[PDB]
Amino acid sequence: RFLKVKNWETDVVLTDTLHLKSTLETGCTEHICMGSIMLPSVATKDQLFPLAKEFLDQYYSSIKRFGSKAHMDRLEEVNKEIESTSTYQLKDTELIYGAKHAWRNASRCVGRIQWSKLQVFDARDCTTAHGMFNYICNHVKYATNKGNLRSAITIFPQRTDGKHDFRVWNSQLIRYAGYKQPDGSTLGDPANVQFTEICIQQGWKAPRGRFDVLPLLLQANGNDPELFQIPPELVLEVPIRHPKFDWFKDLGLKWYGLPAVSNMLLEIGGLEFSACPFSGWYMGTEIGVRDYCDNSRYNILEEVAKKMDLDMRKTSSLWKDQALVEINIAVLYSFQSDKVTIVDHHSATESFIKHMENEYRCRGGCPADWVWIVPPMSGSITPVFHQEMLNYRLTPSFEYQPDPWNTHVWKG
Amino acid sequence: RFLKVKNWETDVVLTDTLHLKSTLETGCTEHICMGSIMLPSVATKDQLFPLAKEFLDQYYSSIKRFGSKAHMDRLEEVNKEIESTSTYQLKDTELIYGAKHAWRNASRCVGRIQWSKLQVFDARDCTTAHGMFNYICNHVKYATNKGNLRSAITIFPQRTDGKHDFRVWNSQLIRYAGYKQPDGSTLGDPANVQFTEICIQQGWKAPRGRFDVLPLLLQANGNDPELFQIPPELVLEVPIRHPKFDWFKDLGLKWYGLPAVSNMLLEIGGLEFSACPFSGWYMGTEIGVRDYCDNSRYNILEEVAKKMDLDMRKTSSLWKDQALVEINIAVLYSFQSDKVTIVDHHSATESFIKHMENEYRCRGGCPADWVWIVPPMSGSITPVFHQEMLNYRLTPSFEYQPDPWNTHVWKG
Ligand code: HEM
Ligand code: HEM
Ligand SMILES: Cc1cc(N)nc(CCCN2CCC(F)(F)CC2)c1
Ligand SMILES: Cc1cc(N)nc(CCCN2CCC(F)(F)CC2)c1
Ligand SMILES: C[C@H](O)[C@H](O)[C@H]1CNc2nc(N)[nH]c(=O)c2N1
Ligand SMILES: C[C@H](O)[C@H](O)[C@H]1CNc2nc(N)[nH]c(=O)c2N1
Ligand SMILES: [Zn+2]
């Protein structure tokens, strides 16, 4: 009823009561745990009012006006609007609160110490794909802020019936293109080979190289999506160099500064925002480990090991491990030397522990997904490795949604 | 009902139906996942027969004689013995099967590809702490096999009433002593400071140094435990050197060859074996990462970084990561150069994937604990990082049990 999580490096115990407010389901049961499953598995008007009331009661509890006159009138005001319209509209203040607590509740995010410093851009007056492009461009410019990255979200109109959906078809606002070859291999980013081809289908002309920034595929109000090129002056990039190995520039690697997710769904008070691109700043490992060294991504451990002169015959020479660390010292160094905000996995995981402490103190808990919080290298030398974490689903939240090209009723 | 687990590096899917045979509870519910909780939380005669029948039905199913005459007679024979004695005794063949499947079912063990090659030593005729010492000595000698390590388990008499318990008080047969100081710090292994002091209480004379092998504290048939020194010729050790850095010998580190757990409980057909030391061989990271580099263990990242000439001022120089890899290349190299069996985390995790495949094919599943299977360094460059895993509890099994000094009714 009042569960306990322990840290096995400091012996610190914390008591979780926030999980009692949890509502959605995890996928786990009393007899099977699905904590390593990546994605465990129209809305009517009856279901909407409890979700609205639940959300309204915590918004007014947060401005220290729980159950007052202003609360009960907005309760009544939203009920009458759900009767009238079968849906409702958030105030600007409720949207900013909802968006900030979707991030706060994001159990897979190690960066949440920053959750209250989120800049929310209301794009609910948008009606066309061009309007979307303009809003997204202003998001990219604001969030980048000349390399002093600022976290932000842009929120396009909520879902209504279902066949009128705003969607960003890119999985991230800024991604590199992936082209397969006649000889079967892959240039660029293999993750986006499918999306890179959809752009070619709709008319993109590819500069078939490595780090080619993809165009935006924007869908407005259910209509077929349309292509727009982000002005290249708006795409900040960092060339990767090493502070010891001057052969590292010869590798000719670079990465974009802005991590900006655009394929998830924002849920606030039962309303569904199918297009809500949000952005922060990178933790180093996301680029240096997953992006650069996944076998099905850029997969550069091969070459970094070569140029270091390493024993690549035997698996147990740990040459993969040894090249992995050099690559991540270089991503960090390059970003910092250009004053482009980045955080190392040691500082980021310390901050999360400190954030976890604050949450248990002033909130009664912190939903956290250990499988996703522990970084993909040097896990046990970071403090989150030794921290027990309870995972549960609170709302407002960010959720996964199917890719648009599997679900969109086309019209030629 | 027939769940699916995916690998996100190869896109291989496998279907799990073994989880339906699962019985015990995980700690997770539909609303909270406890997959990162380390330890989530007398036996009467009524409860014993279903557990015996369940176990007997799968033993005879395994020798291809399910429900035959020999099965039903042993079913009857064990029922009558549970009526008569309120407990029962396993045949030698049932004990060897049970022990092997407790290992097979060990969801936190990455080494299970070896599960059917387990040497089982029946010590159920043991009655005294001296007898225990002799059995454990023969286990240590057999399992070490001059450095060609062999996996083995020794099984002392099962629990009966509860106040007559056989226990090994050491957490492992071979561990290094931990002494705190007058100046507050720690020499040796800080994990065992408590146990190292209990030995001093009962009469151990400490050679207060670093890698001092602890004595055995053995408890027979509920009696107060007694101290025995393993013959030092029986404790194989590997001095750690590096294949590049000749200053590495100056560190003066060494580790024992035999990982041999002695603090867990073996459950077979509802019988409880409170003393069942089992041993295998080390995966490199257990020593080089957890043993050597945990903040609350030996904690040598400090010195290895010094001797490498590293930028220790800034967290983001990844000097911890860089010294971590060198330490693990050295543990591997030292063990292999001495022909003492060890496995690197790359080979071990590949073998587990291949073991997982075999299990799903011929068994319908493989209970696996992702949080424990992914190694504590370079996680995402090993194949288990990208493998979804279902965790569930099958029997026979190894379980945790309280330390004996918290539960033992002493008599001066
Ligand atoms: C401020 C700097 C931030 C850092 C350092 C950070 C770091 C991370 C990392 C490393 C992950 C794991 C993702 C992966 O490994 O692919 C993650 C996940 C996530 N982040 Fe944060 N993030 C930041 C900002 C944000 C913001 C501003 C939001 C939302 C407004 C957000 C929402 C999420 C969500 C919902 C997830 C989990 C969903 C998913 O990616 O599958 N993050 N974050
Ligand atoms: C054959 C070589 C073996 C290897 C390479 C291996 C490897 C591992 C590793 C790395 C762990 C994680 C433990 C930790 O990180 O502290 C583990 C856990 C475990 N091993 Fe294996 N192991 C081996 C043999 C065995 C044997 C022979 C048994 C039993 C007869 C066994 C039973 C277990 C159990 C029950 C656990 C989880 C319980 C726990 O330690 O908390 N292992 N193993
Ligand atoms: C805002 C932000 C900051 C950051 N530092 N990193 C990320 C990465 C999120 C990765 N996540 C992968 C799965 C998905 F595609 F479904 C959604 C995106 C996002
Ligand atoms: C047989 C074996 C082989 C191996 N390579 N490694 C181990 C380590 C087990 C670690 N595990 C920690 C928690 C515990 F103490 F509760 C029980 C022991 C065991
Ligand atoms: C808090 C967390 O559960 C704890 O640190 C676990 C994580 N995973 C682990 N994995 C292994 N193999 N061994 C461990 O001791 C741990 N510790
Ligand atoms: C199979 C497993 O669930 C999958 O690889 C997960 C593991 N943990 C992760 N953790 C983070 N941060 N990002 C990821 O993509 C993943 N992938
Ligand atoms: Zn679970």
Residue type, B10: T
d(CA A229, CA A243): 34
Half-sphere exposure of A33 (CA within 13 A, CB side): 29
- Is A26 in Cβ contact with B26 (below 8 Å)? no
> What is the strand order of the sheet A260-261 is part of?
A119-122, A152-155, A278-279, A260-261
Give yes or no: residues A107 and A199 share one domain.
Answer: no
Are both B30 and B108 inside the same structural domain? yes
Give A374 Cα–ligand 3 centroid separation in angstroms: 15
Cite the annotated binding site of A by residue number: 36, 109, 172, 281-282, 286, 371-372, 385, 400
Ligand 4, pocket-test mutation among B37, B113, B261, B400, most atoms within 8 A of CB? B261
| Polymer length in residues for chain B | 412
| Cα angle B134, B140, B141; round to 5 | 90
**Residue A179 and residue A78 share a domain:** no
User: Could you tell me if B367 and B390 are in contact, meaning their C-beta atoms sit under 8 angstroms apart?
Assistant: yes
The answer to whether residue B384 is domain-embedded is: no
- Say if strands A271-273 and A265-268 run parallel, antiparallel, or are unpaired: antiparallel
Residues A41 and A131 in one domain: no
Task: List the strands of the sheet with A167-168, edge to edge.
Answer: A167-168, A216-219, A226-228
Query: Kind of pairing, strands A152-155 and A3-6?
Result: unpaired
Sheet strands (E) in B240-351: 254-256, 260-261, 265-268, 271-273, 278-279, 282-283, 342-343
Q: How many residues does chain A have?
A: 412
Has B142 been labeled as part of a binding site? Answer: no
In the block, tokens 């993750």 appear at A191
Judge if A330 and A367 occupy the same domain.
no
Peptide bond into B190 cis (omega under 30): no
Residue A305 lies in a domain: yes
Contact between residue A277 and residue A140 where contact means Cβ atoms under 8 Å apart: no
A132 and A86 in a single domain? The answer is no
- Whether ligand 3 lies within 6 angstroms of the CB of A261 is answered as yes
Among candidates B106, B115, B101, which has minimal Cα distance to B392? Answer: B106
Question: Is there a binding annotation on residue B168?
Answer: no
Chain B interface disruption, residue of A325, A344, A350, A395, most B CBs within 10 A? A325
- Chain B positions touching A316 (Cβ under 8 A) are 284, 332, 336, 344, 346-347
Active-site annotation holder among A286, A293, A359, A366: A286
Q: Determination technique for this PDB entry?
A: X-ray
Residues B315 and B367 grouped into a single domain: no
Calculate the alpha carbon distances from B9 to A290, A296, B380 in Å. Answer: 11, 6, 10
Same domain, B292 and B335: yes
A111 and A20 fall within a common domain: yes
Q: Is A41 on the interface with B (CB under 8 A)?
A: no
Token pair 């757990």 in the structure block, residue = B261
Radius of gyration for the alpha carbons in chain A, expressed in angstroms and rounded:
23
How many angstroms separate the CA atoms of A130 and A136, rounded? 10
CA atoms within 13 A on the CB side of B257: 29
The two structure tokens encoding residue B313: 């001022």
Minimum CA distance residue for ligand 5 atom 2: A386
Does residue A386 lie within any of the structural domains?
A: no
* Window 352-371 of B, Cβ < 8 Å to A: 370-371
Q: Answer whether residue A288 is part of any domain.
A: yes
Among chain B residues, the shortest Cα distance to A380 is held by B376
In B150-300, which ranges are continuous DSSP H helix? 193-202, 284-285, 292-293
A286 has catalytic annotation: yes
Domain with B43 in it: 16-124+151-161+265-279+349-373
Contact A32, B24 (CB under 8 A): no
State how far the alpha carbon of B355 is from the alpha carbons of B99, B112, B373, B379, B392, in Å.
18, 7, 13, 19, 17
A266 lines ligand 1 (CB under 6 A): no
The sign of the dihedral angle between the CA atoms of B200, B203, B209, B210 is negative
**A390 and B295: CB-CB below 8 Å?**
no
Query: Do residue A19 and residue B35 have CB atoms under 8 angstroms apart?
Result: no
| Distance between start and end Cα atoms, chain B | 55
Domain identity same for A138 and A169: yes
* Cα–Cα distance for residue pair A102/A107, rounded to 1 Å: 10
Beta-carbon separation of A33 and B35 below 8 A? yes
Structure resolution in Å? 1.7
- Of A163, A159, A174, residue with least CA distance to A228: A174
- Say whether both B156 and B51 belong to one domain: yes
Q: Which helix (H) or strand (E) holds B157?
A: none
Question: Is A307 contained in some domain?
Answer: yes
**CA–CA distance, B262 with B154 (Å, rounded to integer):** 10
By DSSP bridging, strand A342-343 and strand A282-283 are parallel
Domain membership flag for residue B270: yes
Tokens of A47: 């279901």
Phi, psi of A195 (to 5 degrees): -65, -40
Note whether A231 and A296 are same-domain residues: no
Cα dihedral sign, A286-A288-A292-A293: negative
- Residues 88-117, chain B, touching A (beta carbon < 8 A): none
Among A315, A377, A393, select the one facing B346 at the smallest CB separation.
Answer: A315
Amino acid at B209: G
B257 lines ligand 4 (CB under 6 A): no
Point out the domain boundary residue: B347, B364, B385.
B347
In a domain, B10, yes or no: no
Closest by CA position to B123, among listed B107, B108, B134, B111? B134
Going by C-beta distance under 8 Å and a sequence separation of 6 or more, which residues neighbour residue A400?
Answer: A39, A264, A265
- A202 in Cβ contact with A225 (< 8 Å): yes
- Calculate how far, in angstroms, residue A343's C-alpha sits from the geometric centre of ligand 6: 19
Round to whole Å and give the CA distance between B352 and B384.
8
Asked, for residue B91, whether it belongs to a domain, the answer is yes
Quote the number of domains for chain A: 3
Report how far apart the first and last C-alpha atoms of chain A are (Å, whole number). 55
In the structure encoding, which two tokens stand for residue B204, read together? 């151990």
